[PDB]
C-alpha cells in the first residue's frame, strides 16, 4: 500500500481517536453476565443518536502460552465490576495499510451495543462475524461501528476470533491436541456466551441472527453446519461467501512444518518437534511469514490462504469440522432455520490490485484450466479432461479472441462466490425441512461514502460494486461521514439495516415500512426453481432473475460426467 494511503490512514487514525473521545459520554452503566458484572458506557454517533457500548467482554481464556493453537477454554470469572469502556486488541495479523504486524494473542473478546439497555420488550439479537480471509479483521469500531444499526431496536454484537496460523494450525498427530479450526471454535464459544448472556442487555435469547461477510459468511455457514452450535441461534445471513467456497477451507496439515522452517526451525518434519518450535516462536514472527508458506503449485491451483478451516484429522471434545463441509450440509441443523444469502453485482472487481501487480494472470484465461474446480482437475492441469472443463469456463467469461482484465474479474465473481452459492443451494435443498432461503443482489454503486477495503483492493475511482462494497451501508468506519438524509447513500443505509433487522426479527426480509419496497414481492428459492430470483438492491429495489444464472449453469456443466461431486 502506497506511502500516500499510509499517511492518509495515519491522519484518519488520529482523527478517529479524537472523534471517539468526543463521542464518549459520562453515562457508564453496569450489566450482569454469567462471569461477573461489566461496566459499559453510552456513546454518540454523527447522526445524533446514542447507544450503550460494552467492549472487551472476554468469552474465552486468553489463548496464550500453552493454550496457543489449542481449542478455547472458558474464561475465569471475576469479582467486582470489569471495565468494558474500551476495546481490546485485534488478533495478530498483518495490517494491510501499514504492512506491519499488529494485534495481540490476547484477542478473544466481543462487543455489545444497544440504544436501550432496559427495553420494555426483548429485542432481536444480531451477531456479526467479520471477514478478512480468516487472516485479518477485528471488532474495533473504526472498522465496524454499530452507529447505523443502533437506529433500530436491536442488540448488535460484534465478535473477534483467532486469525492466521494462530487460529488455524492443524497437525495430524493426535497426541498433540492441535487438530485445527481453533478460530472456528472461538466463534462457537462466543455464540455460547451470547446465548446465555444477551438477555442481560435487553436481548431475546430465543431470537438470534448470525451474519457475516466474506470469511465471516463462511464462518456463519460453519456455525450453521456444526453440531457444536445446534439451536444456538435462529436465522442466518451469508454475505458474499459460504463454507463450500474454494477459499473457505484448505487441508493444511503439511504446512505447519513449512511455517516452522520459514521461522528458523532446525530439525526434522514431525509434528511434535514442529509444534514445540511453533509454540515458542514470537507470534508476530509467525504471522509475518505466513504469506510465504504456500508453494508455487498451491498458488497456481488457486489456494488462497495457507491456514484456514480444515477437516479435522481426528475428533476431540471441541471438534467443529469432522468431515468436509459438503458432507456436513447433509445433516446440518442450520438447514432448518430461515436463511438469507447474497452477493454484490461485480464481486471480482476486488482482484483489481492483484491483476495490476501480475498482468500475466489474465493469460490464465486462454485455457482457464487453473480455475477448474480443484476436485475435478488433475495435478498439472494438463489432462484432456481438464482442458475440456476449462473450455467451458472460457466460453462463459472470455468475450473476445483474447481475454481481458474484465473477463478475469468476472470469472472470479463466479469461481469465488456465485458458483459455490449455487452448489450450496442445490446440495442444501436435498436436506432441508423446507425453511425458506432468500436471495439478494447488492447493486448500489457510490464513492461518496466508502470503507477501508476500497484502499486495499485499490478501488479508488473504480466503478462497479466490488466484494465488500456493501459493508459501507451497514457499519460506521473511520473513513465515513454524516450523509444528508435524502442522499442515495443515506437511503441505502436505511434500507440495508432495515432489511437485515426485519429478517432478524421475523425470518422474512420483506416489510412495507422500508422505503422503496412498496412493489417488492420477495419469494424464497424453491427446489423446483430452475432460475433463481433475487431482490436486486440499487437506487431502486427490484425483484429480478439472477443475472449470473447463465454463467452459473455453464460452470455446473463441468460436472456433467461427475454429478456425484457437484
- Please give the full DSSP string across 428-445, using - where no structure is assigned: HHTT--S--EEEEEE---
Q: Is 373 helix (H, G, I), strand (E, B) or coil?
A: coil
Closest CA to 232 of 198, 271, 270: 198
Which DSSP category does 417 fall into?
I
Maximal CA-CA distance, the chain: 71
- Cα angle: 66, vertex 69, 75; to 5 degrees: 65
Phi first, then psi, for residue 86 (nearest 5°) are -150, 155
What class is the 1-566 domain? alpha beta
The set of cell numbers assigned to 413 is 465473481
Method for this entry:
X-ray
Domain ranges of the chain: 1-566
Beta strands in 295-436 (DSSP E): 339-344
| d(C-alpha 33, C-alpha 35), whole Å | 5
Q: What resolution in Å is listed for this PDB structure?
A: 1.7
CA 507 to chain centre: 21
Question: What DSSP string describes 265-281?
Answer: --S-S-HHHHHHHHTTS
| 297-326: burial string, b at 16+ Cβ within 10 Å, e else | eeeebbbbbbbbbbbbbeeeebbbbbeebb
Q: State the alpha helices, DSSP H only, in 507-548.
A: none
- Cα angle: 103, vertex 72, 93; to 5 degrees: 20
| d(C-alpha 266, C-alpha 257), whole Å | 10
The set of cell numbers assigned to 105 is 494473542
CB–CB of 549/532 below 8 Å?
yes
| d(C-alpha 361, C-alpha 353), whole Å | 12
Distances from the Cα of 546 to the Cα of 125, 217, 275, 434, 439, angstroms:
30, 20, 47, 21, 9
Q: Is 94 helix (H, G, I), strand (E, B) or coil?
A: strand
Closest CA to 134 of 307, 295, 349: 307
CB–CB of 101/147 below 8 Å?
no
**Close Cβ partners of 190 (under 8 Å, ≥ 6 residues apart):** 59, 60, 108, 110, 159, 161
| d(C-alpha 16, C-alpha 201), whole Å | 27
Beta strands in 214-323 (DSSP E): 235-239
| d(C-alpha 158, C-alpha 288), whole Å | 26
Catalytically active residues, by annotation: 214, 347, 467
| d(C-alpha 548, C-alpha 390), whole Å | 18
SS3 per-residue string spanning 485-522: CCCHHHHHHHHHHHHHHHHHHHCCCCCCCCCCCCCCCC
The set of cell numbers assigned to 96 is 494491510
**β-strands 101-102, 93-94 pairing:** antiparallel
Distances from the Cα of 465 to the Cα of 136, 347, 408, angstroms:
22, 7, 16
Closest CA to 54 of 258, 178, 200, 185: 200
The label of the residue with cell 479508488 reads 460
Torsion sign (Cα): 349, 351, 353, 355: negative
CB–CB of 127/234 below 8 Å?
no
| d(C-alpha 307, C-alpha 323), whole Å | 17
| d(C-alpha 337, C-alpha 438), whole Å | 12
| d(C-alpha 20, C-alpha 18), whole Å | 5
| 385-422: burial string, b at 16+ Cβ within 10 Å, e else | ebbebbbbbbebbbeeeebeebbbbbbbbbbbbbbbbb
| d(C-alpha 366, C-alpha 374), whole Å | 18
Distances from the Cα of 391 to the Cα of 386, 406, 418, angstroms:
8, 18, 19
Question: What DSSP string describes 116-181?
Answer: -SS-SS-EEEEEEE--STTTS----TTTSBTTTGGGSS-EEEEE----HHHHH---S-GGG---S-
CB–CB of 143/478 below 8 Å?
yes
Amino acid at each position: 500500500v502506497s506511502l500516500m494511503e499510509k499517511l492518509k490512514w495515519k491522519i484518519k487514525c488520529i482523527e478517529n481517536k479524537f472523534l471517539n473521545y468526543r463521542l464518549t459520554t459520562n453515562e457508564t452503566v453496569v450489566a450482569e453476565t454469567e462471569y461477573g458484572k461489566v461496566k459499559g458506557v453510552k456513546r454518540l454517533t454523527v447522526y445524533d443518536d446514542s447507544y450503550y457500548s460494552f467492549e472487551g467482554i472476554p468469552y474465552a481464556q486468553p489463548p496464550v502460552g500453552e493454550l496457543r493453537f489449542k481449542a478455547p477454554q472458558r474464561p475465569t470469572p471475576w469479582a467486582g465490576v470489569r471495565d468494558c469502556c474500551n476495546h481490546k486488541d485485534k488478533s495478530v495479523q498483518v495490517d494491510f495499510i501499514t504492512g506491519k504486524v499488529c494485534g495481540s494473542e490476547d484477542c478473544l473478546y466481543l462487543s455489545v451495543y444497544t440504544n436501550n439497555l432496559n427495553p420494555e420488550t426483548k429485542r432481536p439479537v444480531l451477531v456479526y462475524i467479520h471477514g478478512g480471509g480468516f487472516i485479518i479483521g477485528e471488532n474495533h469500531r473504526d472498522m465496524y461501528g454499530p452507529d447505523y444499526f443502533i437506529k433500530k431496536d436491536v442488540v448488535l454484537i460484534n465478535i473477534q476470533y483467532r486469525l492466521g496460523a494462530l487460529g488455524f494450525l492443524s497437525l495430524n498427530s493426535e497426541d498433540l491436541n492441535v487438530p485445527g479450526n481453533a478460530g472456528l471454535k472461538d466463534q462457537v464459544m462466543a455464540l455460547r456466551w451470547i446465548k446465555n448472556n444477551c438477555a442481560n442487555f435487553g436481548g431475546n435469547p430465543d431470537n438470534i441472527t448470525v451474519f457475516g461477510e466474506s470469511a465471516g459468511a463462511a464462518s456463519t455457514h460453519y456455525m450453521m453446519l456444526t453440531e457444536q452450535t445446534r439451536g444456538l441461534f435462529h436465522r442466518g445471513i451469508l454475505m458474499s461467501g459460504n463454507a463450500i467456497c474454494p477459499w473457505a477451507n484448505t487441508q493444511c496439515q503439511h504446512r505447519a512444518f513449512t511455517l516452522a522452517k520459514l521461522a528458523g526451525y532446525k530439525g526434522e518434519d514431525n509434528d511434535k518437534d514442529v509444534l514445540e518450535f511453533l509454540m515458542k516462536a514470537k507470534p508476530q514472527d509467525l504471522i509475518k511469514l505466513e504469506e510465504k508458506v504456500l508453494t508455487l503449485e498451491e498458488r497456481t491451483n488457486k489456494v488462497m490462504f495457507p491456514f484456514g478451516p480444515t477437516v479435522e484429522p481426528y475428533q476431540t471434545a471441541d471438534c467443529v469440522l469432522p468431515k468436509h463441509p459438503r458432507e456436513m450440509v447433509k445433516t446440518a441443523w442450520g438447514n432448518s432455520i430461515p436463511t438469507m444469502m447474497g452477493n454484490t453485482s461485480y464481486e471480482g472487481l476486488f482482484f483489481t490490485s492483484i491483476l495490476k501487480q501480475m498482468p500475466l494472470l489474465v493469460k490464465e484465461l486462454e485455457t482457464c484450466v487453473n480455475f477448474v474446480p480443484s476436485e475435478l482437475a488433475d495435478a498439472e492441469r494438463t489432462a484432456p479432461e481438464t482442458l475440456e472443463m476449462g473450455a467451458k469456463i472460457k466460453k462463459a467469461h472470455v468475450t473476445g479472441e483474447t481475454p481481458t482484465a474484465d473477463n478475469f474479474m468476472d470469472l472470479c465473481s463466479h469461481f469465488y462466490f456465485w458458483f459455490p452459492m449455487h452448489r450450496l443451494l442445490q446440495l442444501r435443498f436435498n436436506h432441508t425441512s423446507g425453511t425458506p432461503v432468500y436471495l439478494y443482489r447488492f447493486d448500489f454503486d457510490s464513492e461518496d461514502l466508502i470503507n477501508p477495503y476500497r484502499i486495499m483492493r485499490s478501488g479508488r475511482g473504480v466503478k462497479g460494486v466490488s466484494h465488500t462494497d456493501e459493508l459501507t451501508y451497514f457499519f460506521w468506519n473511520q473513513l465515513a461521514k454524516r450523509m444528508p438524509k435524502e442522499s442515495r447513500e443515506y437511503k441505502t443505509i436505511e434500507r440495508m439495516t432495515g432489511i437485515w433487522t426485519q429478517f432478524a426479527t421475523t425470518g422474512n426480509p420483506y416489510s412495507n415500512e422500508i422505503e422503496g419496497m412498496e412493489n417488492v414481492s420477495w419469494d424464497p428459492i424453491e427446489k423446483s426453481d430452475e432460475v433463481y430470483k433475487c431482490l436486486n438492491i440499487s437506487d431502486e429495489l427490484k425483484m429480478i432473475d439472477v443475472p449470473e444464472m447463465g454463467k452459473i449453469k455453464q460452470w455446473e456443466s463441468m460436472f456433467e460426467k461427475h454429478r456425484d461431486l457437484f
